[PDB]
Every structure is written in C-alpha cells, then in structure tokens.
Curated annotation (Swiss-Prot), chain A:
Protein name: Pre-mRNA-splicing factor 8
Remaining remarks: Present with 468 molecules/cell in log phase SD medium.
Domain notes: The MPN (JAB/Mov34) domain has structural similarity with deubiquitinating enzymes, but lacks the residues that would bind the catalytic metal ion.
Subcellular location: Nucleus
Organism of origin: Saccharomyces cerevisiae (strain ATCC 204508 / S288c)
UniProtKB/Swiss-Prot annotation, chain C:
Misc: Present with 1630 molecules/cell in log phase SD medium.
Protein name: Pre-mRNA-processing factor 17
Any Gene Ontology biological process: mRNA splicing, via spliceosome
SMART domains listed in its UniProt record: WD40
Coiled coil start-end: none
Biased composition (Basic residues): 1-13
Gene name, Swiss-Prot/TrEMBL: CDC40
Pfam families linked to this entry: WD40
Cellular component GO terms, alphabetical: catalytic step 2 spliceosome; nuclear periphery; Prp19 complex; spliceosomal complex
Swiss-Prot record, chain D:
Keyword terms of this UniProt record: Cell cycle, Metal-binding, mRNA processing, mRNA splicing, Nucleus, Phosphoprotein, RNA-binding, Spliceosome, Zinc, Zinc-finger
Stated role: Involved in the first step of pre-mRNA splicing. Required for cell growth and cell cycle control. Plays a role in the levels of the U1, U4, U5 and U6 snRNAs and the maintenance of the U4/U6 snRNA complex. May provide the link between the 'nineteen complex' NTC spliceosome protein complex and the spliceosome through the U6 snRNA. Associates predominantly with U6 snRNAs in assembled active spliceosomes. Binds directly to the internal stem-loop (ISL) domain of the U6 snRNA and to the pre-mRNA intron near the 5' splice site during the activation and catalytic phases of the spliceosome cycle.
Domain notes: The C-terminal RRM domain and the zinc finger motif are necessary for RNA-binding.
Keyword field contains Lipid metabolism: no
GO cellular component: Prp19 complex; U2-type catalytic step 1 spliceosome; U2-type catalytic step 2 spliceosome
Zinc-finger keyword on record: yes
Residue ranges constituting the RRM domain according to the UniProt record: 135-228
Compartmental location: Nucleus
UniProt similarity note: Belongs to the RRM CWC2 family.
Protein name according to UniProt: Pre-mRNA-splicing factor CWC2
From Swiss-Prot, chain G:
Note from the entry: Present with 1670 molecules/cell in log phase SD medium.
Gene name in the database record: PRP45
Coiled-coil blocks: none
Full-protein positions shown: 110 to 163 of 379
Assembly and interaction partners: Belongs to the CWC complex (or CEF1-associated complex), a spliceosome sub-complex reminiscent of a late-stage spliceosome composed of the U2, U5 and U6 snRNAs and at least BUD13, BUD31, BRR2, CDC40, CEF1, CLF1, CUS1, CWC2, CWC15, CWC21, CWC22, CWC23, CWC24, CWC25, CWC27, ECM2, HSH155, IST3, ISY1, LEA1, MSL1, NTC20, PRP8, PRP9, PRP11, PRP19, PRP21, PRP22, PRP45, PRP46, SLU7, SMB1, SMD1, SMD2, SMD3, SMX2, SMX3, SNT309, SNU114, SPP2, SYF1, SYF2, RSE1 and YJU2. Interacts with CLF1, PRP22 and PRP46. Interacts with SPP382.
Cysteine disulfide links: none
Compartment list: Nucleus
Name the UniProt record assigns to this protein: Pre-mRNA-processing protein 45
Family statement: Belongs to the SNW family.
Chain's role: Involved in pre-mRNA splicing. Associated with the spliceosome throughout the splicing reactions, until after the second catalytic step.
C-alpha cells in the first residue's frame, strides 16, 4: 500500500447519497441501527427473490 | 433458522429494555475527567 | 375578505384543521374471568354484539364482543350452547341430562326437555323447523318440539347439525361414521364412514359440511395437513379453521384444501392445558375458547 | 336527474369484502413478479363475477362529478367500486351530455380512460382499436352464463334485451340460435365500451330461477368486440350510413373553407 | 437522546408525569397505524400514510401548545422532549414563523420536491382557490394533498 | 431557493416497509421495478450499515437514514 | 401556442428510458435518384485461356 499510491481525483463531485438526496424520491429520517439492519435484510431479500 | 423470517423490530425488539454493554468501571479518583463522557455515542458532542 | 369573515369561514370546517374538511390471522385480545374450562361458545346472530360461553364451572357468562351477565341454573358442566335466530330464545344443554330453554328477555328458565338417558353433548336449532335437535351419550338423536327419535349408530354422538332442505340432520359419533338423516321417514338417507372418531362438524354458510377426524379433515357435499391430533368453524370468505389439542391452530381455504397458516397460542401465566376447546366466527373475527379458561379473539 | 343527480353514489363493495388480489390456485408455487401461479398444468381461469351493477340503484353523484371528470369508473361497471361517493371517476350510465364531453377524447381511448390499440386482440376481447369505431358487441358464452338451463331460444334473447337496455341506448339486438350468440349494437361507442366491461363474466340467472344459488359455480358469459356483419342486407346498410356520415361532414367542412377563404 | 430508553438516556424532568397519559394515546395510535392493514388500493394505502403524518403533527402541536402558547411545561422538560424525539424540532421551528403558523408538515413547503419550484397546494388559502375556480365556473378540484392528506395549512383559514 | 431535507417521522418509513410485504396487487407493479433497479445500489447500503455498527460499549445507536 | 418544454425528475431506481429495448429493425432504402454506373465502352477479345 505504501509502494503503490492510488491518488483520488478531485473532479468526483457527484457522491451517491448526496445526489439521491436531491431527488424527490428519497426521504430522510433517523431510526435505530438494528431497525435499519432488519429493513435492509427484508429489502435485500425482496430484491433477490 | 432460514425458514423463519426476520422478526419485526416493533413487535419484538423495541418494547424491551436492551442490556448492559461492555463498560470498564472507571475508578473515580484516577479517571474523573473522562468518566462522565467516555462511553457516549458521540463523546462531548454538545460540549461547545 | 375581512378578518371576521375568515374567522367565521374557518369554523365551517368539520374538523379543527389542517385536516378538517371544507366539504393470515393474528391475536387481537384475550379475555379473563372464567373459573374453569370453557367448553362451548354461542354467538348472537342478529347483531353479533354478545357471546354466550358455557363453562366447566356450569355458569354461562355473556361477554360483549366486558362481562354483561351471568347465567347459572345447571348442576353439571355445560357441553353445548345454541342461540335461536327467529326467536329470542337460548337453548343450553349440559352433562345433567337436561336441555334447558332460556328466554333472553327476562333471563329465566322457561322449559326443560326430558327423557334423555345420559348426558347431552349437543344442541342444534333451526328457525324454520321450530324444533330442537339434541344428541348425547344416549346415541340417538332426539327431535324435540319447541317427538321424533332417530335410532342410530351405536356409539355416542359427538356433533349434530341441521339444514333446511333434505338430509336435514347430520350426525357424527366416536364409531367414526357420519350419517345424513331423513327425519320424516326417520331412517338414514346416507351413511358416510370415510372417517377412521369424528370430533367436530361445521356447515358452510355451498350447502356442504366439513368432517373432522384425528388426523384427517374431510369435506362432504379432503384436506391436506400434517398430523394435527384432533372443533371446526367456517368463515363466510370460505376459510376453514381447525382447532388442535396440541394448541396448533390450522387455517385452510375450503376450495383448494391447502393449509395456508398454522399458529400456536401461548398457554397462560401447564403445557398440556393449552388446547382450543371451541371456536366460532361472527356474522372477520374468530372467538376461541381455551380449556385453560381464557377466551382469545383472533383478527 | 331523478334517477341519478338526486342522490349520491353508494359503496358497492366494502373494502374488506373486496376479493383477494391473488388468483385462484392453478399451480404449485406463486409467482411474485407476475402475480400468477407457475408450476401448474392448465386452467379455465374464468369464473363468474361475484358482483353486478344495479344501474338505477348504485348510480349517483361522485367526487368526479364536482371535479369535472370525463371518465367513468371501471369498477362501477363491474359492481366492485369500494370508494363510492369519494371516487375520482364517474358513477352513471353514459348519456348524450357525457359522451359530448368525451367527443374529442373518444378517438384514442375508451370511456374508462384506457388507451386503445392499433389492431384488435386475437380473440376480439380487451379495450378496442382506434382504427374502427366499433359499436357492436359479441355476446357469447351464454351456455355458461345460463348455467346450462335450456331456456328455449327466444327467452335467451329476451334476457339479453333486458340487461343490456339498462346500460344505454341500443341500435339493434340480434340473437343467433344456431351459433348460440348475440350481437348488441349501441347508439354510441361509449355505451358499448361501458356495457362490455359491465357484462363481462356475468350471469343471466334472474333470481326467480331455481339456479340462483349456483350462479357462482358457472363459467360466465363472454362479451367481446364484434366482427363485421357478413350479410349484404347489413353490408349495404354500412355504406349507406357511411354515405350519410360523409355528407354530414362535407357540410361541416365547406364551412371551414368558407371561414378560411 | 435516542427514542429507546437506554442507560445513556437522561431521566425525564418534573412535569412529565402530568402529560404522559396524553402522549401515550398518541403513541398507541401510531402503533395501530403502522399495523400493516392490507389494502389493495393505492388510493387507500397512502391514506394510511396520511394518518401517520396527521398523528406526527398532532403530537407536536400538543408539545408546542404546552410550552409556547400556554407556558405549561418548563424549558428543561421541553428540551428533553426534543432530544427524546417526542416533538419535531424543525416543524415546531416553522410554527413560530408568521406565514407558517398552522403548517401542514415540512414536506409540503419543499420547493425541490415539486415539478415547479412551488409549495404544495394545501399551503394556498382556500379563498384564493375558491376565487380561481369561480372564474372557471367550476368547483375547486383540490381535496387532499398527496404528501400527507392536508386540507389547507394556510394561517388565515 | 434551497431548503434542506424535511426529516420524516420514523413511522412513515415503517408503514411503507410493512406495506411492501405482500406485493400482490397491480398497484405494486411500479414498485417492483424500484426494488429491482435498487439492487446495484445495495452494496453501498451494506457499506454504510456496517461502518455505522455499534461498538461494544453501546446498548443502541440511532442512525440517520435515507430511504426510497 | 407558446409551449414550455420541461424534463421530468426521473426516479433513480426505476429504469430510465422505459421504451428502450434491445430489438432489431430492418431498414428501407431511400432510392430517389438512380446513380449512373458510368463505365467506359468495351481489348475485349478473349480466347479460352481463362
Ligand atoms: Zn368508483
Ligand atoms: Zn397541508
Ligand atoms: Zn403536508
Ligand atoms: Zn400538502
């Protein structure tokens, strides 16, 4: 890792969570962590099935 | 088990007292400057 | 618009605002209060507001679908209870070898039915017959005028049902034969012996009857389950509910016979005590009587 | 007015009384994307509709009457609408005032708002084509709808005349005893589109009938779009009404050139 | 600081036991509203999401009228109710503004959610909607907004 | 002309996920494409969940979420 | 009619370009003018050597 540095490019201004926040199709709240883990297991099961 | 679904947060998890976490007892005369805020979620978050 | 007008026009809204206008099965509740195990449940057809439940303590407690009233007057355990549709009369039958009529108006015993040899286990009432059918360990169906005794299969009759058209009386016994009865001739119309002790029967509200045995539940005009070890109720949707001695509650669709869901009720504050003794459905709700002494409502 | 505008629309089916969204099981496992059954042999998969439109009973003012809705409620026609007077779409039989609002809109889509198609479906069912202004319905499946009652030949036609007359103005009704099917032609296309969805999968049992308790067990009757009438007694009628439509349009069209000059 | 009573969480101040039966009734209605009542209509399913946004508004109006209007609870209790998520900090922060007195919710004023750079139509006064529909000769076609089923949050009505 | 994101209640998310258990109606045909077109974004949701995992000295942890 | 043309805010999860499929199209040829094949006339004598 020290011998081969991979430097980050500066023009990457579009992050994923920031550009989805700008869309009307994503809303925001605060929930528990274990609640958000159980949703992502339920959602990710619903995706693959 | 893989047959039972992931049980819902609200019917099962949210109603119960959690449990004690892993916390060292933090002797008061030797650790008095950190013992009030060491095991917070974000320590000293609202201290200006 | 003026401020006094806008103050007046905002009082036209039905609510206060901002929302005022300008224009499977699960256990919902449990009920306590029965001293001993509740054998049978009866529902009022006219409104569905109250349930009359028999108990092993011999008292009949009327429960609002709170405790409205208590009906005593039997010496022995009540094994069946029936509520008439045309008449405001309740027919209860117990282990005291008597079928006692109840006037719902005054809450007093009006009549007692006689001549049963041994304890009555069943009562069925049609509005159109103006007759009551009582069956027992006597093994013979008695047609009582509110007259005909049906000499029957040898063994004790577990359940009885009554329908308006022909093959009116349906009988089930511990010998595992189910008979369709022609009451006018007083002989059997048909004998169905496909059961291998029939513990329950429910009439679909399709002109058909569900027949329940220890391991197999069949429908006569076959349901697939694992071993369920012994009451049946038919919802109007066509769903079929099966009680289990193991506390497992087997729900099935009657058209396909596939069992969609199985659930086990929590016992109480012994393990063997949790069966479902009897179950019924309102005229979207399921009312079930446990032998431990609790009535649980299912939504 | 007295039948429709006096009252409000009423809830036909309670939302708990609505049918289950999963179909009747004709397979081994249920498919979640395509809401159907997969590992199955076959099935007729057509059943008698449990619900029916009582037209003089259920019609009334709705939310879409006050909003200026152009489009009729689909589940009003099926007798299944759970919203009742809170529903965004209209709850009444199409009238000359209603179809005159739809006159710009009827060219591409039906009275229910559903978009029409280039060519017809293979079995002449569905919504319809915009290339043909078809106003005639194929009433089929009468044997299943009757529940197999013999019913004579004239009586089956009389039942078709009674039910489809409540659904709008009728041009003609022809029943064919040999083919065991009827052909109902309406004055407007919007009444044919309404009566197609209204009488799809229905019965003709007329409850004084013995079967009325077994109306659900049957197959149901097919109302699909009709083909062209092959006889030259009616073919010559078609070019005559197309001639009269053409002369009524040329008078309208020379006035457009009169304004244009 | 969370919703869950953890051991990092601070015990409630003095006036909490008087208002706790009123806040429990909002809490059991929100548990009955999230109950997964299976409904096949999209017109009915968002109407069940509309009932939650009403109960979130009404639980926050109650804590707003205790502290700001009638001054019935202390500031230390009111800060505890915000940190324990009993009250919406940023929706109460709009009720203090002049045009946003009876504000429907924070979503119905977002200029970025809408296709225009506009608020929801339930922010518009009803007398304005009656006037524009009077010129068209029709009744007003708005009944309930799609975000939370409001019927007018404008402070004048 | 930028106001920040509106901070929905927790139950609003909770009702949606309970409602999308049995997606059998015709109304869910658009939402099934949303479940299917989100699968490429799912590894990013696992990285954000596992990095915010509670440390052993915490009973519970409230995290700020973004949801479709 | 002066008509403002705007774009809809696309759902990042629904597939953009809903009418876009991988289908195959045969194309007709637009032949309005004939192109003259401008050869020269005809050293055309040849034995059976080829
Ligand atoms: Zn409707
Ligand atoms: Zn609003
Ligand atoms: Zn709002
Ligand atoms: Zn709004």
């Amino acid at each position: 890792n020290e011998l081969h540095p991979t430097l980050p490019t500066n023009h990457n201004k579009t992050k994923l969570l920031k550009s989805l926040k700008n869309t009307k199709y994503f809303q925001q709240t605060t929930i528990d962590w274990v609640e958000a883990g159980l949703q992502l297991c339920r959602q990710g099961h619903n995706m693959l099935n | 088990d893989d047959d039972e679904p992931p049980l819902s947060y609200e019917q099962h998890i949210e109603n119960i007292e959690p449990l004690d976490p892993i916390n060292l007892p933090l002797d008061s005369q030797d650790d008095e400057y950190v013992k009030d805020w060491l095991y917070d979620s974000r320590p000293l978050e609202e201290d200006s | 618009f003026t401020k006094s007008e806008l103050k007046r026009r905002r009082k036209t809204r039905k609510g206060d605002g901002p929302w005022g206008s300008w224009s499977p099965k699960k256990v919902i509740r449990n009920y306590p209060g029965h001293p001993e195990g509740t054998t049978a449940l009866k529902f009022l057809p006219k409104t569905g507001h109250l349930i009359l439940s028999g108990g092993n303590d011999h008292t009949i407690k009327i429960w609002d679908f709170e405790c409205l009233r208590d009906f005593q007057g039997h010496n022995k355990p009540i094994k069946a209870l029936r509520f008439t549709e045309d008449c405001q009369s309740f027919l209860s039958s117990s282990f005291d070898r008597s079928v006692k009529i109840w006037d719902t108006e005054t809450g007093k015993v009006k009549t007692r039915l006689h001549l049963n040899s041994t304890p009555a286990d069943v009562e069925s009432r049609p509005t159109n017959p103006h007759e009551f059918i009582v069956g027992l360990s006597n093994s013979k169906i008695l047609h009582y005028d509110d007259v005909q005794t049906y000499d029957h299969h040898l063994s004790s009759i577990l359940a009885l049902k009554y329908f308006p058209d022909g093959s009116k009386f349906i009988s089930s016994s511990e010998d595992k034969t189910v008979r369709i009865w022609e009451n006018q001739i007083n002989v059997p119309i048909k004998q169905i012996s496909d059961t291998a002790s029939m513990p329950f029967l429910n009439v679909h509200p399709n002109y058909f009857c569900a027949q329940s045995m220890d391991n197999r539940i069949y429908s006569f005009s076959k349901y697939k389950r694992h071993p369920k070890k012994i009451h049946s109720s038919a919802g109007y949707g066509i769903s079929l509910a099966f009680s289990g001695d193991g506390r497992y509650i087997c729900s099935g669709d009657s058209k396909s016979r596939l069992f969609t869901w199985d659930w086990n009720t929590s016992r109480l504050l012994i393990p063997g005590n949790k069966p479902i003794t009897q179950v019924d459905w309102h005229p979207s709700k399921v009312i079930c009587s446990g032998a431990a002494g609790k009535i649980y409502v299912c939504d | 007015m007295t039948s429709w505008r006096d009252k409000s629309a009423k809830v036909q089916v309670k939302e708990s009384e609505l049918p289950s969204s999963i179909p009747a099981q004709t397979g081994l496992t249920f498919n979640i994307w395509y809401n159907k059954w997969s590992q199955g042999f076959a099935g007729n998969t057509r059943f008698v509709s449990p619900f029916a439109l009582q037209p003089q009973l259920h019609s009334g003012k709705t939310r879409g009457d006050n909003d200026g809705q152009l489009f009729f409620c689909l589940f009003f026609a099926k007798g299944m609408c759970c919203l009742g007077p809170k529903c965004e779409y209209l709850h009444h039989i199409p009238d000359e005032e209603d179809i005159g609002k739809l006159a710009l809109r009827t060219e591409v889509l039906d009275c229910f708002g559903r978009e029409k198609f280039a060519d017809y479906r293979e079995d002449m069912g569905g919504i319809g084509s915009f290339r043909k202004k078809n106003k005639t319905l194929y009433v089929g499946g009468i044997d299943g709808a009757l529940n197999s009652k013999h019913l004579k030949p004239a009586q089956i036609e009389s039942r078709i005349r009674f039910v489809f007359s409540r659904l709008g103005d009728i041009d003609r009704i022809r029943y064919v005893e040999s083919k065991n099917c009827g052909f109902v032609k309406f004055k407007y296309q919007a009444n044919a589109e309404f009566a197609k969805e209204a009488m799809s999968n229905q019965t003709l049992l007329l409850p004084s009938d013995k079967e009325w308790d077994d109306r659900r067990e049957g197959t149901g009757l097919l109302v699909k779009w009709a083909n062209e009438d092959p006889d030259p007694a009616a073919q010559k009628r078609l070019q005559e009404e197309l001639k009269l439509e053409s002369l009524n349009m040329m008078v309208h069209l020379i006035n457009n050139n009169t304004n244009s000059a | 600081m969370p919703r869950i009573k953890t051991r990092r969480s601070k015990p409630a101040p003095d006036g909490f036991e008087k208002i706790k039966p009123t806040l429990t009734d909002f809490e059991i209605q929100l548990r009955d509203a999230q109950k997964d009542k299976s409904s096949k209509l999209a017109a009915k399913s968002n109407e069940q999401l509309w009932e939650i946004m009403q109960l979130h508004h009404q639980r926050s109006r109650y804590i707003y009228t205790l502290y700001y209007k009638r001054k019935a609870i202390s500031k230390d209790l009111y800060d505890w109710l915000i940190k324990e998520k009993y009250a919406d900090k940023l929706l109460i922060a709009k009720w203090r503004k002049t045009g946003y007195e009876k504000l429907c919710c924070l979503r119905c004023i977002q200029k970025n959610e809408t296709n225009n750079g506009s608020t929801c139509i339930c922010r518009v006064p009803r007398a304005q909607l009656e006037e524009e529909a009077r010129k068209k000769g029709t009744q007003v076609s708005f009944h309930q907004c799609v975000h939370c089923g409001c019927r007018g949050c404008a402070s004048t009505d | 002309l930028y106001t920040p994101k509106a901070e929905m209640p927790p139950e609003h998310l909770r009702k949606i996920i309970n409602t999308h258990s049995d997606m059998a109606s015709k109304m869910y045909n658009t939402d099934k494409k949303a479940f299917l077109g989100a699968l490429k974004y799912l590894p990013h949701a696992i990285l954000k969940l596992l990095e915010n995992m509670p440390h052993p000295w915490e009973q519970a942890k409230e995290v700020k979420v973004l949801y479709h | 009619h002066h008509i403002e043309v705007v774009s809809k805010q696309m759902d990042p999860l629904l597939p953009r370009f809903v009418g876009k499929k991988a289908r195959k199209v045969v194309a007709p040829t637009e032949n309005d003018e004939v192109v003259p094949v401008l050869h020269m006339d005809g050293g055309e004598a040849d034995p059976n050597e080829w």
